[PDB]
Design an enzyme around this catalytic site. Structure first.
Site, PDB file in Angstrom:
ATOM      1  N   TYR B 363       0.791  -1.210   0.000  1.00 62.12           N
ATOM      2  CA  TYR B 363       0.000   0.000   0.000  1.00 62.12           C
ATOM      3  C   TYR B 363       0.837   1.280   0.000  1.00 62.12           C
ATOM      4  O   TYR B 363       2.008   1.231   0.376  1.00 62.12           O
ATOM      5  CB  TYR B 363      -1.044  -0.073   1.133  1.00 62.12           C
ATOM      6  CG  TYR B 363      -2.222  -0.955   0.732  1.00 62.12           C
ATOM      7  CD1 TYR B 363      -2.082  -2.339   0.763  1.00 62.12           C
ATOM      8  CD2 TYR B 363      -3.426  -0.415   0.298  1.00 62.12           C
ATOM      9  CE1 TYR B 363      -3.135  -3.179   0.372  1.00 62.12           C
ATOM     10  CE2 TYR B 363      -4.471  -1.231  -0.096  1.00 62.12           C
ATOM     11  CZ  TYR B 363      -4.313  -2.613  -0.050  1.00 62.12           C
ATOM     12  OH  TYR B 363      -5.390  -3.389  -0.454  1.00 62.12           O
ATOM     13  N   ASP B 377       0.570 -12.590   0.175  1.00 60.07           N
ATOM     14  CA  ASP B 377      -0.511 -13.566   0.125  1.00 60.07           C
ATOM     15  C   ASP B 377      -0.183 -15.040   0.197  1.00 60.07           C
ATOM     16  O   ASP B 377      -0.730 -15.769   1.015  1.00 60.07           O
ATOM     17  CB  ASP B 377      -1.509 -13.279  -1.001  1.00 60.07           C
ATOM     18  CG  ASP B 377      -2.214 -11.956  -0.875  1.00 60.07           C
ATOM     19  OD1 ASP B 377      -2.727 -11.538   0.196  1.00 60.07           O
ATOM     20  OD2 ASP B 377      -2.295 -11.176  -1.848  1.00 60.07           O
ATOM     21  N   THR B 385      -3.806 -23.380   0.685  1.00 62.67           N
ATOM     22  CA  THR B 385      -4.726 -23.704   1.786  1.00 62.67           C
ATOM     23  C   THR B 385      -6.018 -22.941   1.601  1.00 62.67           C
ATOM     24  O   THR B 385      -7.069 -23.529   1.835  1.00 62.67           O
ATOM     25  CB  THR B 385      -4.074 -23.318   3.141  1.00 62.67           C
ATOM     26  OG1 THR B 385      -2.909 -24.131   3.250  1.00 62.67           O
ATOM     27  CG2 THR B 385      -5.130 -23.400   4.232  1.00 62.67           C
ATOM     28  N   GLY B 458      -8.318 -13.039   2.737  1.00 61.36           N
ATOM     29  CA  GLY B 458      -8.939 -11.835   3.280  1.00 61.36           C
ATOM     30  C   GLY B 458      -9.938 -11.261   2.269  1.00 61.36           C
ATOM     31  O   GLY B 458     -10.871 -11.942   1.874  1.00 61.36           O
ATOM     32  N   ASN B 459      -9.758  -9.991   1.875  1.00 58.36           N
ATOM     33  CA  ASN B 459     -10.652  -9.330   0.956  1.00 58.36           C
ATOM     34  C   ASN B 459     -10.341  -9.585  -0.517  1.00 58.36           C
ATOM     35  O   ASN B 459     -11.234  -9.304  -1.305  1.00 58.36           O
ATOM     36  CB  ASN B 459     -10.610  -7.803   1.179  1.00 58.36           C
ATOM     37  CG  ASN B 459      -9.199  -7.252   1.135  1.00 58.36           C
ATOM     38  OD1 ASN B 459      -8.305  -7.839   1.717  1.00 58.36           O
ATOM     39  ND2 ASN B 459      -9.053  -6.125   0.415  1.00 58.36           N
ATOM     40  N   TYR B 460      -9.196 -10.051  -0.911  1.00 57.61           N
ATOM     41  CA  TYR B 460      -8.947 -10.241  -2.360  1.00 57.61           C
ATOM     42  C   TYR B 460      -9.064 -11.642  -2.861  1.00 57.61           C
ATOM     43  O   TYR B 460      -8.807 -12.580  -2.072  1.00 57.61           O
ATOM     44  CB  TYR B 460      -7.457 -10.259  -2.755  1.00 57.61           C
ATOM     45  N   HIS B 518      -2.541   1.128  -4.227  1.00 53.83           N
ATOM     46  CA  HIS B 518      -1.621   0.056  -3.901  1.00 53.83           C
ATOM     47  C   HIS B 518      -1.243  -0.655  -5.202  1.00 53.83           C
ATOM     48  O   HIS B 518      -1.765  -0.265  -6.240  1.00 53.83           O
ATOM     49  CB  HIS B 518      -2.283  -0.955  -2.916  1.00 53.83           C
ATOM     50  CG  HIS B 518      -3.605  -1.466  -3.525  1.00 53.83           C
ATOM     51  ND1 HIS B 518      -4.757  -0.711  -3.523  1.00 53.83           N
ATOM     52  CD2 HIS B 518      -3.906  -2.622  -4.153  1.00 53.83           C
ATOM     53  CE1 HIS B 518      -5.717  -1.384  -4.128  1.00 53.83           C
ATOM     54  NE2 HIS B 518      -5.227  -2.546  -4.520  1.00 53.83           N
ATOM     55  N   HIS B 520      -0.318  -4.625  -7.179  1.00 51.80           N
ATOM     56  CA  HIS B 520      -0.510  -6.076  -7.132  1.00 51.80           C
ATOM     57  C   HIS B 520       0.729  -6.572  -7.900  1.00 51.80           C
ATOM     58  O   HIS B 520       0.896  -6.304  -9.105  1.00 51.80           O
ATOM     59  CB  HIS B 520      -1.733  -6.615  -7.856  1.00 51.80           C
ATOM     60  CG  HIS B 520      -3.030  -6.280  -7.119  1.00 51.80           C
ATOM     61  ND1 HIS B 520      -3.492  -7.041  -6.076  1.00 51.80           N
ATOM     62  CD2 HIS B 520      -3.908  -5.274  -7.296  1.00 51.80           C
ATOM     63  CE1 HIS B 520      -4.615  -6.522  -5.631  1.00 51.80           C
ATOM     64  NE2 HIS B 520      -4.892  -5.448  -6.354  1.00 51.80           N
ATOM     65  N   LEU B 528      12.166 -23.528 -16.931  1.00 52.12           N
ATOM     66  CA  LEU B 528      12.124 -23.898 -18.356  1.00 52.12           C
ATOM     67  C   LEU B 528      13.406 -24.689 -18.646  1.00 52.12           C
ATOM     68  O   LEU B 528      14.408 -24.214 -18.118  1.00 52.12           O
ATOM     69  CB  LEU B 528      12.250 -22.594 -19.222  1.00 52.12           C
ATOM     70  CG  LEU B 528      10.949 -21.757 -19.089  1.00 52.12           C
ATOM     71  CD1 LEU B 528      10.934 -20.417 -19.831  1.00 52.12           C
ATOM     72  CD2 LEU B 528       9.729 -22.566 -19.538  1.00 52.12           C
ATOM     73  N   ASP B 664      25.314 -13.863  -5.762  1.00 50.81           N
ATOM     74  CA  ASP B 664      26.555 -14.475  -6.182  1.00 50.81           C
ATOM     75  C   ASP B 664      26.899 -14.201  -7.637  1.00 50.81           C
ATOM     76  O   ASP B 664      28.017 -14.459  -8.097  1.00 50.81           O
ATOM     77  CB  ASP B 664      26.447 -15.987  -5.980  1.00 50.81           C
ATOM     78  CG  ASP B 664      25.065 -16.531  -6.360  1.00 50.81           C
ATOM     79  OD1 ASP B 664      23.986 -15.960  -6.076  1.00 50.81           O
ATOM     80  OD2 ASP B 664      24.915 -17.607  -6.994  1.00 50.81           O
ATOM     81  N   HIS B 683      -2.838  -0.020  -8.816  1.00 45.42           N
ATOM     82  CA  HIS B 683      -4.272   0.198  -8.713  1.00 45.42           C
ATOM     83  C   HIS B 683      -4.742   1.509  -8.120  1.00 45.42           C
ATOM     84  O   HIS B 683      -4.595   1.703  -6.920  1.00 45.42           O
ATOM     85  CB  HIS B 683      -4.883  -1.005  -7.953  1.00 45.42           C
ATOM     86  CG  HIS B 683      -6.426  -1.020  -7.910  1.00 45.42           C
ATOM     87  ND1 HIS B 683      -7.134  -2.007  -7.263  1.00 45.42           N
ATOM     88  CD2 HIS B 683      -7.344  -0.176  -8.433  1.00 45.42           C
ATOM     89  CE1 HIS B 683      -8.426  -1.769  -7.385  1.00 45.42           C
ATOM     90  NE2 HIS B 683      -8.581  -0.664  -8.089  1.00 45.42           N
TER      91      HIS B 683
HETATM   92 CA    CA Z   1      15.875 -25.083 -16.516  1.00 50.33          CA
HETATM   93 CA    CA Z   2      22.323 -18.497  -7.968  1.00 50.73          CA
HETATM   94 CU    CU Z   3      -6.062  -3.691  -6.275  1.00 53.62          CU
END
Ligand code: CA
Ligand code: CA
Ligand code: CU
Ligand code: CA
Ligand code: CA
Ligand code: CU
Lengths: 720, 718
Positions: B363, B377, B385, B458-460, B518, B520, B528, B664, B683
């Site tokens: 925020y 989050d 969960t 929560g709210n989101y 705030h 996101h 990959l 490193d 936002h």
């Molecule tokens: Ca890889």
């Molecule tokens: Ca590394």
């Molecule tokens: Cu937002």
């Protein structure tokens, strides 16, 4: 007598499904969803019963229907998607009769000449104020229907205005120095001139081509280089690039590199032939239509609306949920979305008077003879509405789309009906909103978008434009590009060959001896938004990090710098996606005292690398002739004659007659009628995955209500 | 018999009756069934099935045998799900393995009485053995193992158990780490505020006559080198309060400038901060429809009457040329693994593991109830969960298949999340098209396979889509919806006296309500392996150069290509106008070009875009989370580097995430690389987002770049 069901329905264009277990046929066509059991005396159309005198007949495994089945069922009236327009909308395009009438009126003047062609025959629009009074107050427009008739007499442009109500010519004006766009017969003339050319056949022969009759030509505009290209500015010229037809249905894959012919259309002759080194024509068969491939098995997937659609099409007006708008077709720019309003608890609020593609440019970056002048202004120089590509049902649009036919004038002045010119379809677009409060029942609603899709093909490229109406007031505009790449014939087969490095300096090696030359696709949309009224102002809101001066542990805060953008010149700018640009109505606020506005997002994303501007040095002419390409946002005062970003007559133009011109006087944009122009595009660096045919790549833009409403727009009707 | 509609609806199937055809259409996930009353047979995915007992119509209600569901839906005719005879080595821990792992650590003398479990997940075999199982069917030959992270009071301990041998392999107290917020913590906070005489007194002062209607919300406090006056060894949570007024939306009634600090081990409020008193916004602002009537709409169905084109074997999804494994984790949600693309018969590696890495919602208001607000989050609350079961037909299209997933709860008991992930194929416009003038059209439809997961904290409410395109591209989109965190203010309209100060850090979205600005910020960890383990990062910058070839042009379009050799140089801002590839320098396509994947961290979004952190470089959140300021990161593969914000981000004093993994500055030349993509929005609110916010999306893309030798969807040659 009666006719064979499958044959007839297919010819008619309906999807036909037979269910052997249920002994039921399901027939689908646009807004009609029909069910019919062989031998039954009734059929079901959009959930409603329809009596049939003659039942579907099953014979030895063949279904047969009465010769009136298609009209009795599909035109019954139970499919309510389309309704008859009572009071004709003042923005309705010219009908075939009106087109024929405008043409007789000019032919009746002593100046028409035999070879006179028509580059554009379109409605001359009533004044905007009267059009809105009609849309909102139903007040008749008492000004006479008129048509703009633009002719090409040989190479000279003349502008004529005819009064359709009084059947008379109102003006006839020669336009000096202007060049006309390229017309269909020009393509045929070029091929014919090449075919009769003794010298061209000789040039072609020394490059390995035996049968010169196998040479396919293509007509390109030449642009303007202040004479360095050694071309007379006065002449009607076209440059011709050639390829070898090898029978694979894809001549684009066999370029004859370094051979350019300059053709003078009035003289009907090759006036010049530029030639460079001889590069062997890539000959390998590279079909893209599947003739050499296996067709995989896939299971069916259908999107169905068994009870009919949620939108209604009355004449050219579309009504859907809270939206109302008029949709028509133009031969140059394609679809035009007008008098767009959003129904806010009974009151229709203005959103946009007229929206459409403005123009587009596709400039290449190779300096070679067959490429340096290539900078296609597809709509202005070729007429994209005229080149509309009929929608392939279920493929180019979802199986639940409604396909509209549109009528425009061809270059000889005869009405031309484009079948399946535009697709209209509602689509599921994920959850509109959701909140799963811990331990409570969930809250989720589905999002629905209404899509207006149009596709136009110009030579090797196929463009797709979607005008997306979100139920929540948002409006999206997406552009997709597909088709066949314009390629360069080169000597390397692989990046390991000696000429590889030089052959790929301007493009990627996408096949043996084939390079996909780098280029950009730059689209510009002209949007005459009228935010809850005509008088609006441009406001900027830049999120900024400012030092914290309120105490506590934080060193910084997130604030916003808000300021008005007062004139046209400051409104012409680059768009930083991290900022906010609003078109607001300083005369109207929402419930919290904020000016009702629409946020303008010229850049909402894309699948190809983004064009940050035109990839040309500032001293190039294409750069000078077309300013629109370098800024993403422009805002200009409303002028009924300022419609194209590249200018009204861009073919071999010597100076900006477009956005550079419309804004050069730098007028005030404070509390006045504004017109938004969004430019967005891609920078296309090729890859093997795009050859022989390219996967559609998309660019997205958005217009979102910003404090236009007082709360979540789709919450629903208030109960108390 | 048994009543059909009742039975079926209890089963979760959709029932449609067509009186004209006298036919029932029953649909559930991959099953599309057709059956007529009295018929001796039915149809399941276009195939005939003999019934032991025809459906019977009695008093206009159908009845079916007690065995119907099983004989029809479990007939074998619905081929969507196939049996997994040889379990993939990345299969998540089952409910039995979770109970067993819990018994192994409870059997140890070091296990203390009220220990909680922040995470119980599989400790997977090494990457090489897992790829060999997927590509060669080679058995991994290691016992199933689990990592078991416990919270003893406020103390974190990491154990490792061998499930096969049923033995504890290691027990390690983790010094200085603070545990994530567990569900019981939400109730202690509320209980602790409810029993505090001081807080009730603070509340009364603020206009609240009944402290029993006060709803608390627990928040991590972050770290401010002590400037917030908080002890670093204490397990603390800050509490922001709202007033329940019966509208089902306590978020719409903030009690501004009142923050309590709770010590979870002492079970008490150890500090209370009070600022100017602002009357609580009172007007009912429900978002659940109790006060609304929706307009009626004609139905829309997306159907696949012959079944799906994908098959799910255990957790292995096969679809067209794609093959991948889908598993669930309690912290980050879905993990997509061993992803290969079948190129004309040969499976080629694309991605060993992909998943959300971590996310943050910081925020920008300096005030007392906002300055420390920065939700991690997944890291601090556990997104897996908190998965939100998909609302069939609404959160996902009507033709989706909804999967149940199992994870362990904070007390170590298996928890089955119903409809945890939606899998669905969708039409996505034309794949390609070419309408050559005067010739027959060429057009093919595009199909995308989407893996969708929703988590609510929560709210989101956050929605994540992993999109497999038939042509080889992979998209990752993130949508945000839910209820905005608002600040109570005195201004009712922008014409009021305090409006300007009231909106300095956010938009006035309702009377007396400001939606605080705030961002996101989402980060995706993507291991990959482009056609192989050993890859390199290559930059390709389109540039304008002087023409030196002659002719009228003064400039040309060329590209500046160069390798990015180390982790530090690979940590960078992403310019959407440039190209970034993860190439395999050991393999080339038919044209001699290195097979690669083009990485696009920013392919679009509907909310303003975040170019980096909207924080000054000396902010503590900025120092703890370097991931937020760079959109692309590439690091050498390491099994224990998985979160951009670090393993233990609660009250972290320094960056233990991506800042540590790249610190490193190792070599990225021809070696096993991991790409991390940071994408986010800034936002600034509007009235259109209150009381409930219209979903906003962000898009990312991974595209094959000379990975193939031609258009991948043309098909096999006859
Ligand atoms: Ca890889
Ligand atoms: Ca590394
Ligand atoms: Cu937002
Ligand atoms: Ca002007
Ligand atoms: Ca306007
Ligand atoms: Cu292109």
């Amino acid at each position: 007598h009666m006719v064979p069901m499958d044959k007839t329905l297919k010819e008619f264009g309906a999807d036909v499904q037979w269910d052997d277990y249920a002994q039921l046929f399901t027939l689908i066509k646009d807004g009609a969803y029909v069910k019919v059991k062989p031998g039954a005396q009734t059929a079901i159309v959009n959930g409603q019963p329809l009596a049939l005198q003659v039942p579907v007949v099953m014979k030895d495994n063949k279904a047969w229907v009465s010769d009136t089945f298609i009209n009795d069922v599909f035109q019954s009236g139970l499919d309510q998607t389309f309704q008859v327009e009572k009071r004709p909308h003042p923005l309705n395009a010219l009908t075939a009769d009106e087109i024929k009438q405008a043409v007789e009126i000019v032919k009746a003047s002593a100046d028409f000449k035999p070879n006179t062609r028509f580059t554009e025959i379109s409605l001359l629009p009533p004044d905007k104020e009267a059009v809105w009074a009609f849309a909102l107050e139903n007040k008749p427009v008492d000004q006479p229907r008129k048509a703009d008739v633009i002719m090409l007499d040989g190479k000279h442009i003349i502008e004529a205005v005819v009064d359709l109500q009084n059947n008379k010519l109102l003006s006839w004006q020669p336009i000096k120095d202007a060049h006309g766009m390229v017309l269909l017969d020009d393509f045929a003339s070029v091929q014919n001139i090449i075919n009769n050319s003794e010298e061209f056949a000789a040039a072609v022969k020394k490059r390995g081509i035996t049968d010169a009759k196998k040479v396919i030509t293509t007509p390109l505009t030449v642009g303007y280089f202040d004479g360095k290209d050694g071309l007379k500015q006065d002449a009607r010229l076209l440059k011709v690039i050639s390829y070898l037809d090898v029978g694979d249905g894809n001549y684009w894959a066999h370029p004859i590199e370094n051979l350019v012919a300059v053709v003078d259309l009035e003289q009907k002759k090759i006036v010049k032939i530029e030639e460079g080194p001889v590069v062997p024509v890539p000959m390998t068969a590279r079909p893209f239509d599947g003739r050499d491939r296996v067709a995989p098995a896939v299971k069916p997937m259908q999107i169905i609306e068994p009870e009919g659609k949620n939108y209604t099409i009355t004449g050219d007006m579309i009504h859907w949920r809270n939206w109302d708008f008029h949709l028509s077709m133009n031969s140059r720019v394609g679809p035009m979305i007008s008098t767009v309003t959003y129904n806010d608890n009974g009151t229709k609020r203005k959103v946009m008077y007229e929206g459409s593609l403005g123009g587009m440019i596709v400039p290449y970056g190779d300096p070679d003879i067959g490429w340096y002048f290539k900078a296609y202004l597809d709509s202005g120089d070729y007429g994209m509405g005229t080149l509309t590509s009929p929608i392939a049902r279920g493929k180019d649009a979802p199986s639940n789309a409604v396909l509209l036919n549109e009528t425009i004038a061809d270059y000889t002045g005869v009405p031309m009906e484009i079948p399946r010119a535009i697709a209209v379809f509602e689509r599921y677009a994920g959850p509109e909103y959701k909140h799963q409060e811990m331990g409570q029942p969930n809250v989720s609603t589905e999002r629905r978008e209404l899509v207006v899709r149009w596709i136009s093909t110009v030579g090797n490229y196929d463009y797709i434009f979607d005008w997306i109406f979100h139920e929540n007031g948002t409006i999206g505009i997406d552009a997709g590009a597909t088709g066949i790449e314009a390629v360069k014939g080169v000597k390397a087969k692989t990046m390991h060959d000696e000429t590889a490095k030089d052959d790929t300096r301007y493009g990627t090696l996408i096949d043996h001896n084939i390079v996909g030359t780098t280029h950009q696709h730059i689209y510009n949309f002209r949007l005459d938004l009228d935010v809850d009224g005509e008088n609006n102002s441009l406001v900027a809101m830049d999120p900024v990090v400012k030092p914290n001066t309120a105490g506590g542990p934080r060193t910084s805060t997130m604030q916003v710098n808000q300021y008005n953008i007062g004139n046209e010149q400051d409104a012409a700018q680059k768009f930083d996606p991290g900022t906010i640009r609003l078109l607001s109505n300083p005369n109207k606020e929402n419930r919290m005292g904020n000016p009702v506005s629409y946020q303008i997002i010229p850049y909402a994303g894309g699948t190809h690398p983004v064009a940050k501007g035109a990839q040309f040095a500032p001293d190039e002419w294409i750069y000078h002739r077309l300013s629109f390409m370098d800024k993403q946002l422009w805002v200009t005062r409303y002028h009924p004659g300022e419609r194209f970003p590249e200018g009204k007559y861009p073919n071999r133009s010597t100076h900006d007659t477009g956005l550079g011109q419309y804004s050069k006087d730098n007028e005030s944009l404070d509390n006045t009628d504004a017109v938004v122009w969004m430019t967005t595009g891609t920078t296309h660096v090729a890859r093997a995955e795009e050859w022989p045919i390219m996967p559609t790549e998309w660019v997205h833009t958005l217009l979102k209500p910003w404090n236009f409403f007082d709360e979540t727009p789709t919450l629903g009707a208030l109960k108390k």
